Swiss-Prot record:
Domain of life: Eukaryota
Tissue expression remark: Primarily expressed in lung and placenta.
Gene encoding the protein: PRKG1
Annotated binding of 3',5'-cyclic GMP 2, by residue: R70, G79, E80, K81, A82, R89, T90, Y124
Compartments, as annotated in UniProt: Cytoplasm
UniProt miscellaneous comment: The 3D structures in complex with cGMP and cAMP describe the hydrogen bonding interactions that modulate high selectivity for cGMP in the CNB-B domain, and reveal that all these contacts are disrupted in the structure with cAMP, explaining the low affinity of the enzyme for cAMP and the fact that cAMP can only weakly activate PKG.
Subunit relationships: Isoform alpha: parallel homodimer or heterodimer and also heterotetramer. Interacts directly with PPP1R12A. Non-covalent dimer of dimer of PRKG1-PRKG1 and PPP1R12A-PPP1R12A. This interaction targets PRKG1 to stress fibers to mediate smooth muscle cell relaxation and vasodilation in responses to rises in cGMP. Isoform beta: antiparallel homodimer. Part of cGMP kinase signaling complex at least composed of ACTA2/alpha-actin, CNN1/calponin H1, PLN/phospholamban, PRKG1 and ITPR1. Interacts with IRAG1. Forms a stable complex with ITPR1, IRAG1, and isoform beta of PRKG1.
Chain sites annotated for binding 3',5'-cyclic AMP 2: G79, E80, K81, A82, R89, T90, Y124
Official protein name in the record: cGMP-dependent protein kinase 1
Free-text function comment from the UniProt entry: Serine/threonine protein kinase that acts as a key mediator of the nitric oxide (NO)/cGMP signaling pathway. GMP binding activates PRKG1, which phosphorylates serines and threonines on many cellular proteins. Numerous protein targets for PRKG1 phosphorylation are implicated in modulating cellular calcium, but the contribution of each of these targets may vary substantially among cell types.
Amino acid sequence: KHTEYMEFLKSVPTFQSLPEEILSKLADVLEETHYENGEYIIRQGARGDTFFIISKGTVNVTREDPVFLRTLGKGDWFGEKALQGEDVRTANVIAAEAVTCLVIDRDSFKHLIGGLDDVSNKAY
Ligand SMILES: Nc1nc2c(ncn2[C@@H]2O[C@@H]3COP(=O)(O)O[C@H]3[C@H]2O)c(=O)[nH]1
């Protein structure tokens, strides 16, 4: 799996700009997690410690009745806001089909991903 993860991370513009040794560590520590259609991946208001990169499928993002914000797909990512400052989730993320996410915990994110301009300067 490590090699599959590497080839994938090297294909995503946000992450292909990272040194390959950092990508190798990410591939080492990430957890592959799977969801079915309609499954809540993140709930607004919860406290979070994980970052997600979509490696298969699509998700819907909604936010306080909730309003639809956008859909994200393979190579997109989400969950950074709870890792920036306060740890609260700011929106819901819901699987829109069979989804696989590569999940990175806070310990790894703060060292390997948090300084990336694409992520740190991400605006919606
Ligand atoms: N607050 C907000 N989050 C969004 C939006 N579009 C995608 N997201 C993602 O939805 C995620 C919910 O978890 P986080 O708040 O940690 O991080 C959020 C973002 O990564 C948006 O328009 N507003």
